[PDB]
Design a protein around this ligand. Structure first.
Ligand code: FMN
Ligand code: FMN
Ligand code: SNU
Lengths: 306, 306
């Protein structure tokens, strides 16, 4: 007998799967659909203090090997996600993460001051989006985490952009290890500022920023696994949430091998809808059955080096 | 009717194709094979002052979507590549680039001082490998460009790692634009420190650095196009050489669209051998024929934004 059960931050999760922040989690209908899905959890769209329209369309393109987007943080604003967490979310069904992406330190501080009460009362968990972007400015990242830690009397996690250098893994891990309240690290946000060109149209495929946008899906899996494993190794006091290139139970298996506790699904969820969670749980159980694993703890972070 | 001809750096190239530094360019036989190939040019393996055995094997793995490697600069040493450039290379067949990757500023300075006379006499062109790794440290990058510019009385190019943030494109371009001897930028080196995990073996697939290695091939094409275009726009005084994810004439077409003058081939060449250049010239001409382009000048850098 087998279990996808994950236990972290005083919560039980039926399975490690959840949406990636920003994918099918902006509207009430999406948040309800994610709650009604077979997902172990869900995270609300990264919120700003006030609603944002986001970037001009097209701002997302599905690709053979994943996706490119420059959404520009279209979101209903903090009040809307706070209200969802405070009064609508069925915590009996699954735990809720709220993604926060203040455009300044003050914005994160003011939102966290108000989130604190709802975290206490309802158990919503903050995923603070740090993804130059804050996570690529080590001083700015420490300052942000200091400001948030000062005012937010709860465990939270950080959504990280990918790093590509051991010096950056070390520098980032050193900063995150200064903050015991950072109990999880979500690796990774998009591979930033890719440029998809359609050979047929001789054009870019998204409107904002001259066609430059975050890569998701198959493009990002080895980068995601690298970041998951790098932080799994350097932040042993923290859990890692995997995000990047999950289409199958086998991909999820790789995330967990690399060190992932929770496994977030972005591009694949965008393309398939929340029914994907029934397939992914089924496929991960099938991979574990074939490999004679009963629990995720048996192979989490146990990727073999040569 | 049609021409792949490229005119740059006081040279004529039959076509824009060449090997990526470090692929099929370490040994005499490889350099001869590249010279005898249909490629418009070639670049010698990134060299250190002395022979290096490189990292323990396995250190390269071909993947469905590209490759991962941690070669560790296995090379015959600077004297070997200088002797090839000085005494053996048939400049009547095609121009030659020499890739240099000193492990310190001092190493680059000493090799550049000796390269100077061979560049003068024979016309070999330096590709200085800046790919934390030097180009991710803007101070180290400025240092090595200052040192090389001070001692090296010729134009040269720089092999750049990919950036993922406009702040980094701007910072890198600002530095490169301060060095008029930098006449070409090769975008990109590998996407650094990916981690490929084999679901079957539950292991990494290369031995060095716990399985972390540079990604090439399909994985890197949108990142390569982004870097090519970003530097094409921000360094209007300089040529861009494309490198990353070229398997087909169509991929090469995308590089040139993005702003590439020369198109380097790594992973695809590693898998196919130098015969690939006959296929790539044929395919790029076929793409141009179907699109009614006669010359690369007609569409270089002309990618359409929305
Ligand atoms: C349409 C879309 C919107 C996204 N919005 C957010 C966001 O609001 N917050 C966030 O942290 N990441 C956001 N991301 C990044 C994803 O959460 C995820 O890190 C990335 O897509 C990689 O996962 P994937 O390979 O499964 O797509 C978004 C990605 C997509 C495709
Ligand atoms: C086996 C191997 C060795 C490489 N050695 C070098 C090197 O010596 N110097 C260098 O600048 N880049 C080196 N690279 C990076 C390639 O030049 C190229 O930037 C990268 O592979 C991306 O191109 P691709 O997608 O065509 O493989 C190497 C890549 C591979 C796969
Ligand atoms: N100073 C700095 C920080 C992060 C990077 N980076 C490289 C790849 C992604 C981030 C580069 C330079």
């Amino acid at each position: 007998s087998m279990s996808l059960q994950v236990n972290l931050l005083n919560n039980t999760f039926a399975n490690p799967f959840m949406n990636a922040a920003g994918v099918m989690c902006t509207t009430t209908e999406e948040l309800v659909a994610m709650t009604e899905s077979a997902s172990g959890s869900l995270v609300s769209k990264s919120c700003t203090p006030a609603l944002r329209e986001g970037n001009p369309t097209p701002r997302y393109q599905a690709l053979p090997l994943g996706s490119i987007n420059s959404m520009g943080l279209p979101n209903n604003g903090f009040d809307f996600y706070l209200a969802y967490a405070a009064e609508q979310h069925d915590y009996g069904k699954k735990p809720l993460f709220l993604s926060m992406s203040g455009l300044s330190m003050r914005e994160n501080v003011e939102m966290c001051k108000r989130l604190a009460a709802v975290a206490t009362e309802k158990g919503v968990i903050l995923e603070l989006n740090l993804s130059p972007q804050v996570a690529y400015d080590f001083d700015a990242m420490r300052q942000c985490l200091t400001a948030v830690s000062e005012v937010y009397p709860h465990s939270f996690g950080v959504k990280m952009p990918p790093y590509f250098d051991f010096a950056h893994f070390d520098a980032a891990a050193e900063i995150l290890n200064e903050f015991p309240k950072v109990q999880f690290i979500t690796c990774i946000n998009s591979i930033g500022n890719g440029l998809v060109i359609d050979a047929e149209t001789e054009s870019v495929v998204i409107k904002p920023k001259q066609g430059f946008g975050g890569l998701g899906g198959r493009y990002v899996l080895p980068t995601a696994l690298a970041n998951i494993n790098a932080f799994y190794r350097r932040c042993p006091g923290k859990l890692i949430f995997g995000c990047g290139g999950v289409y199958t139970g086998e991909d999820a298996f790789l995330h967990v091998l690399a060190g992932a506790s929770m496994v977030q699904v972005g591009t694949a969820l965008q393309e398939e809808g929340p029914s994907i969670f029934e397939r992914l749980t089924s496929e991960l159980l099938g991979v574990m059955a074939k490999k004679r694993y009963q629990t995720l703890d048996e192979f989490r972070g146990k990727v073999r080096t040569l």
